[PDB]
User: What shape does this take?
Amino acid sequence: SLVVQEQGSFQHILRLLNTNVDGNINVVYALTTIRGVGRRYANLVCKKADVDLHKRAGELTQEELERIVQIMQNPTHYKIPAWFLNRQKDVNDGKDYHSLANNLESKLRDDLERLKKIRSHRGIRHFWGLRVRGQHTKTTGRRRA
Amino acid sequence: AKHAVVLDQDKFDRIMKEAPTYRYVSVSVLVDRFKLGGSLARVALRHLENEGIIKPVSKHSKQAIYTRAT
RNA sequence: AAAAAUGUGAUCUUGCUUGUAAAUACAAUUUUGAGAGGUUAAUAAAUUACAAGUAGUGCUAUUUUUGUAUUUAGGUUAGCUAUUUAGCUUUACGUUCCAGGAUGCCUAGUGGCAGCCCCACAAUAUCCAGGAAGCCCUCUCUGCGGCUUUUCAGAUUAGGUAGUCGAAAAACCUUUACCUGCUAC
RNA sequence: ACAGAUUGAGAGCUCUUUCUUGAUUUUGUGGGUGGUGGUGCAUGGCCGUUCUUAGUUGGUGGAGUGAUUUGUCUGCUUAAUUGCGAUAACGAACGAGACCUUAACCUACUAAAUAGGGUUGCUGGCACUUGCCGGUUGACUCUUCUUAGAGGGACUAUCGGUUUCAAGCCGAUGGAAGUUUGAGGCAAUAACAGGUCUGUGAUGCCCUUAGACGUUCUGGGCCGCACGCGCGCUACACUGACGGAGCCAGCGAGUACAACCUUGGCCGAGAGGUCUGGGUAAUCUUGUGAAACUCCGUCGUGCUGGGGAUAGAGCAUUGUAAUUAUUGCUCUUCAACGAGGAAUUCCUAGUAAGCGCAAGUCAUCAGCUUGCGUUGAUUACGUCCCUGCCCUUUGUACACACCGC
Ligand SMILES: [Mg+2]
Ligand SMILES: [Mg+2]
Ligand SMILES: [Mg+2]
Ligand SMILES: [Mg+2]
Ligand SMILES: [Mg+2]
Ligand SMILES: [Mg+2]
Ligand SMILES: [Mg+2]
Ligand SMILES: [Mg+2]
Ligand SMILES: [Mg+2]
Ligand SMILES: [Mg+2]
Ligand SMILES: [Mg+2]
Assistant: This one.
């Protein structure tokens, strides 16, 4: 809509949630780049914040960033339906929750560990370093981790 | 990245200087004369179409052909 | 680089013939899965650095002002082809990877809306053509496919011959080839 | 044959049991029966392939003692042994053609409130003059589009060249149609040791034949992964991606003894739930308002918002049973891949390619398949260079026929 007038040049590459938010580009894109946030989720976050998706937003404000962080942290406090999440329904009798960065990775690791402990078919597969979701490796994917 | 995405006052001024000249102004044309990248170029073009200066030929999405007055 | 001025037996800076001080790092995907034995043989590169014998030229050149600088910037091979003012690759040299140091014309370019604003076309050679992984190979840390076998069989098929495959102990790092199958109103 | 041990196990499977059951049986011996057991090189039928190529045959008559041969062919034509011609051959049959089905034309017939329109009633909105768009099976009438009956219509037609002025071919004109009008359906003789005895109460023989290789339950498995090839899909984006908005097909299919398609209304971000219908179907689903497309905006040539894999979680549904994700949806992860070497496939017009739909299988699953329509090109309209195949003449120690001897 408008070309960025004024001096500009407000920080190339911001650091947020122990990860690299890329300068310029767009808020959603930055979120995606973070290890744990995706596209739709990012969009939702942006909407919640109340910033234009048109703006490149490496020239973002601090308050806005803080708000975003808060949103990331908390599903239930803000208006997020709580079945839109990465994780939901976990531990004994309790609540749905998700992380979005380093935190997300940690959570994933924990989950993996739990699975391993359980020794479920999926867990076993994971341990092996193999195909959890029953896809046929008779022909396909001949290299693997 | 190949740069030509960073935004400045100086850059804006150079862009302005000027809408006049060039048989046609096409986002593509703008980039890369090494100007502000795609979206930015489009925005600039739009601005140029505010009050004369550069009149249009086509109006399509991405095939936006403009030419100098008058 | 620009500028005012001190002083050196007037001053100034184009390389020629010599020997020593140093930068081509690091490695890994690979090499026959790990260790040892050789950069085997071969071989120093002009590049920077100080001083000689002065063609040069009297060798060493000092004290103070103006600006963020205002300085002059960019890029070259090597091979194949009757696409030979063009086409294809593009640092080759045991196999796999390598990079430019400077004698230089470079040149402040010619084209397309030159205008700075991008596109493409134009700058001989190169002196070295040199370094890193891999480098014929032999013992080890002592490997899994041989050694016979005896048991059988899977079978191999239309039938059969000779070989081959599969389950049980001892050193050493093919399921095919070939023979034999049928007659009036 | 309840009861618990038994048992994977509310399998009386049994050993614990001591009640039922009444001549079915049952214990043998002849004798059958079943087998997705074997052998397709023991067979049937069907199919595939030689080959949808142009080939095949016999009656006279001639040539040969004869097997045989000629006819069935130098040439030119044709998609075709299609014809014209030349001719010990003449006239014939099969195959091709004709045929059939479908795809195209019909303001010419016969027809319709299960197909579509016209006037008009009531009726909604407009400009506000009479006019424009509508909605209603209110009336009246029509058959162009619709269907689908009966017919016609194309025969290379007319003209020009070209060709022994033949077969034909080439070009203009008209014509819906001028590639055999397009597309198929069928499709000869002789065969193959091609496939199928896992479609088959089609079947020879062998095997098996009551702790079965019969059956039947239960749990798996066909889906496993150092890795080869084969159909396929998705992409490597800017002829795009993403958002909106525009918004148009044709083949179909679809339940009452089941549970089919399922509009319309409410709940749900979705998937999907619910109530209600309509449909046994030109009537309802359904104009299947399918996609690819078209318009305006957002990213601009960065492994990027290209690309979507693997992944984690939850929400759904089908079923008895979903972990070895059935499938759908929601968020998250963001891998390889900047058009692919040697090679090799498919293709000549509504084709190729793209795009979706569609039924088939189906409780549930589409990247598959048979069809369908939508968008719709590039380049030939030739040749034997390759490949295969066909003939002819040649040579042959071959005839189980070069995998030969
Ligand atoms: Mg049976
Ligand atoms: Mg049988
Ligand atoms: Mg057979
Ligand atoms: Mg056979
Ligand atoms: Mg005769
Ligand atoms: Mg004959
Ligand atoms: Mg004529
Ligand atoms: Mg036909
Ligand atoms: Mg209908
Ligand atoms: Mg990405
Ligand atoms: Mg299938």
In short: The first helix of chain B runs from residue 9 to 16. The helical segments of chain B are 9-16, 27-30, 38-48. Chain B touches chain A through twelve residues (CB under 8 Å). Chain B has three helices and two strands.
